[PDB]
């Protein structure tokens, strides 16, 4: 959950390497995308689109075991100065495509760093940020230019709780090397099913492995599989992903002059060629 | 007034120089692709002007390189334009070169009378690529520092002198200040000299043998 | 019309040049005003104008302060270094990498010594060259792209 | 750090160039000579 | 972010011919 | 795209215009 990034990594969701801390608990990797315009003018509302696709007609394991669907969520890192557009500066057309999203700032102040989710995946395969570009003209310390944008997006339950304990949307190795004896499956009048496996043989040993209700079983009975071995199966169909992009907080004048100069240049080119032609005609009289 | 021409003509023979020019001719086999050289040159002159420009504000030190760049981008008048042109023109110089190499090759213009022009051109290309790589690291940002931190180890595979070479380019065992110093010296002093000597050769030969023949 | 002055094949001096493959600037359109003074500036301003436009529309960024302790993920050299970077990473033997790289300019140096076997300019009249060229140009772009994929999905380019 | 616009200009221009070059190699591999070679 | 690439590729390629032809046309209309 | 395309065409055409315009005006006044 985006807000767990917030609790576990207070100061920022992005490590010096660019990783983004969501990768710490959500260990699968599915693809993720951000689309903004190539350029925006100062002080202008624009649309930043996060994409977080997954096979919609697909289900994941629930915490107790069921088989519900998954939610999506992202952290979007806009450049300094940028922020979510004022409710009132958002045109109807766009308000409608944004939905009931709670853009939530990583920490007080950091309004350009946005957390969002969990939101139901069936509807929010793409999430639309109404963002309002800053104004170099009134904020002396925001400058025109190209800036990075960072995104981390996730769908599906993660693998590790902030407490630090494993979840159930992953696999469970084997406690130690040896042979398998019995596999029981308790069900505490509260704590749902929890198949229990036992090892042993060779150098003593009598350890046990208790595995939550949700993952499969791809183990049989009476086999000697060493310690740390895939005896669970991988339940997880979720995953987390990153994308980066850039946007140019562009100044109209820079463009307007650039145009004027391009026009001067073409004009000047024309004049040279027209000239060449004059010379060609003049040279023609020197042929004879 | 008093004909400046005659003044110069008496001493230097300004005229023999005009005549060498107005007696060259461009053969009909010569199409727009025979501009890639000049265009590559033109991208270099743009690099020279803007690169010089930046040597007035950029500071080749691990403590100030990044801020100097930031300063050139945010605070210097048209600095953003000067740095941006230096980036694009770097990219186009290399590209236009490669196109030029295509034209030379699919025109057999590197043959007998002219293998020296082609060899010198290959050196140009190695010099040109060295600019790109040294310059890439002057911002001393994350991208650039890491790129340097890699290429710089490559030489170590070479058998007897692979570590010495590496050491010479990086000013010691690891990347660091020494490296930025050396890359700066390279990018703003060594390479512009080397590239000028070899362009000088490339052009001189070219002027000596004229363009290649029609195909 | 244009402007044309045919080779003076009556001049021994021109002929000796042609013989050593080399008098082609004595005939054609006159290089001075016609080109030098009128189309060269056009090409120069054009070259400059595109670069300026690109620089305004898509200016340079400032990335993040170098960190010795933190290796980027998303670290590629510029495009013209793709192939070499490809070659360099996807070859388990470092020395062989170096040599293959060094072979790119050493190679291009031999080119005029190898293809000196004849004197054909026109690539049609030299199908073997034109082919080894095209082949190489292909392989080149091939590894260039490969550099942008992950190591494994690299050669295949994810297709086979 | 990659760069889509450039990467694209690169290929467009590479192919358009390789192309027009062969086109020119060809246009002359047919109506060639004249002037005296 | 990669729709920029093909956009640039097509146009950089394409606009050459537009320029080329545009050039030729000028030639016709002048009388070369 | 559509909006670019329009401007593009109008921009080029506009200049193409001035080109042609200038030839003749320039031609049919004995400068060419």
């Amino acid at each position: 959950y985006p807000f767990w990034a917030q609790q576990t990594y207070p100061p920022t969701p992005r490590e010096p390497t660019g990783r983004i801390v969501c990768a710490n608990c959500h260990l699968a990797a599915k693809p993720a995308e951000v689309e903004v315009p190539q350029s925006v003018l100062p002080d202008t509302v624009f649309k930043a689109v996060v994409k977080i696709p997954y096979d919609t007609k697909l289900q994941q394991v629930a915490a107790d075991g069921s088989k519900v669907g998954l939610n999506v969520g992202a952290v979007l890192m806009l450049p300094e100065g940028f922020k979510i557009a004022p409710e009132e500066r958002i045109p109807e057309e766009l308000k409608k495509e944004v939905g009931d999203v709670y853009f939530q700032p990583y920490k007080e102040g950091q309004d350009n760093v946005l957390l969002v989710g969990p939101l139901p995946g069936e509807q929010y395969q793409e999430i639309v940020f109404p963002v309002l570009s800053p104004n170099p003209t009134t904020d002396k310390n925001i400058h025109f230019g190209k800036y990075a944008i960072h995104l981390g997006a996730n769908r599906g339950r993660g693998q590790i709780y902030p407490t630090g304990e494993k979840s159930n949307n992953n696999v469970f190795t084997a406690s130690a090397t040896g042979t398998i004896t019995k596999i029981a499956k308790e069900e505490d009048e509260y704590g749902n099913v929890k198949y229990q496996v036992s090892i042993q043989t060779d150098s003593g040993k009598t350890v046990v492995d208790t595995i939550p209700a949700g993952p499969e079983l791809i183990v049989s009975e009476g086999q000697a599989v060493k310690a740390g071995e895939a005896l669970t199966n991988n339940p997880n169909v979720g995953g987390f992903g990153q994308d980066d992009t850039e946007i140019v907080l562009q100044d109209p004048n820079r463009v307007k002059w650039m145009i004027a100069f391009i026009c001067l240049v073409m004009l000047a080119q024309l004049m040279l060629i027209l000239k060449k032609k004059q010379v060609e005609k003049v040279q023609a009289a020197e042929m004879n | 007034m008093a004909n400046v021409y005659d003044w110069f003509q008496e001493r230097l023979e300004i005229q023999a120089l005009a005549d060498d020019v107005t007696s060259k001719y461009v053969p009909p086999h010569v199409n727009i692709f025979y501009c890639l050289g000049g265009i590559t040159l033109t991208c270099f002159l743009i690099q020279f002007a803007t690169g010089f420009a930046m040597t007035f504000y950029y500071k080749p030190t691990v403590t100030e390189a990044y801020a100097s760049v930031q300063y050139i981008m945010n605070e210097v008048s048209f600095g953003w334009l000067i740095r941006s042109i230096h980036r694009w023109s770097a990219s186009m110089m290399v590209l236009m070169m490669i196109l030029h190499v295509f034209r030379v090759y699919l025109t057999g213009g590197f043959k007998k009378p002219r293998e020296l022009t082609w060899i010198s051109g290959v050196i140009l290309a190695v010099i040109t690529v060295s600019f790109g790589v040294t310059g890439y690291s002057l911002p001393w940002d994350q991208v650039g520092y890491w790129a340097v931190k890699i290429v710089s180890g490559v030489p170590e595979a070479i058998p007897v002198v692979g570590v010495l070479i590496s050491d010479l380019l990086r000013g010691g065992s690891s990347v660091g200040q020494a490296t930025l110093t050396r890359y700066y010296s390279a990018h703003t002093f060594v390479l512009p000299w080397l590239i000028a000597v070899f362009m000088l050769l490339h052009f001189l030969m070219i002027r000596k043998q004229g363009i290649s023949g029609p195909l | 019309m244009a402007t044309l002055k045919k080779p003076d094949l009556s001049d021994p001096k021109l002929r000796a040049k042609l013989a050593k493959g080399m008098g082609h600037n004595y005939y054609g359109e006159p290089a001075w005003p016609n080109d030098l003074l009128y189309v060269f500036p056009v090409v120069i301003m054009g070259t400059f104008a595109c670069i300026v436009a690109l620089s305004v529309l898509d200016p340079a960024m400032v990335g993040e302060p170098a960190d010795p302790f933190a290796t980027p993920l998303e670290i590629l050299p510029e495009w013209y270094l793709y192939p070499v970077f490809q070659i360099l990473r996807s070859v388990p033997n470092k020395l062989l990498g170096v040599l293959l790289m060094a072979s790119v300019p050493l190679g291009l140096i031999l080119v005029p010594f190898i293809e000196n076997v004849n004197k054909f300019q026109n690539p049609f009249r030299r199908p073997v060259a034109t082919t080894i060229f095209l082949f190489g140009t292909l392989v080149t772009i091939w590894l260039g792209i490969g550099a942008t994929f992950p190591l494994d999905k690299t050669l295949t380019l994810g297709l086979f | 750090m990659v760069e889509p616009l450039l990467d694209g200009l690169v290929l467009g221009l590479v192919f358009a160039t390789l192309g027009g070059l062969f086109y020119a190699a060809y246009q002359q591999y047919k109506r060639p000579n004249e002037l005296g070679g | 972010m990669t729709e920029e690439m093909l956009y640039a590729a097509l146009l950089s390629f394409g606009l050459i011919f537009v320029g080329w032809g545009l050039g030729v046309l000028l030639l016709k209309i002048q009388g070369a | 795209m559509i909006l670019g395309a329009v401007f593009y065409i109008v921009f080029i055409a506009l200049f193409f215009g001035i080109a042609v315009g200038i030839i003749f005006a320039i031609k049919s006044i004995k400068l060419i």
């Binding site: - | - | - | - | 050459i16 537009v18 | 921009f11």
Partner: peptide, 29 residues
């Protein structure tokens, strides 16, 4: 937000007009 479009277009136009202007100028390819 469409002075932006005129901007890129300016790029395409000079690149085009430039080629056009060369070809025309040297009757060329």
């Amino acid at each position: 937000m469409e002075i932006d479009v005129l901007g890129w277009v300016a790029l395409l136009v000079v690149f085009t007009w430039s080629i056009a202007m060369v070809v025309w100028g040297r009757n060329g390819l």
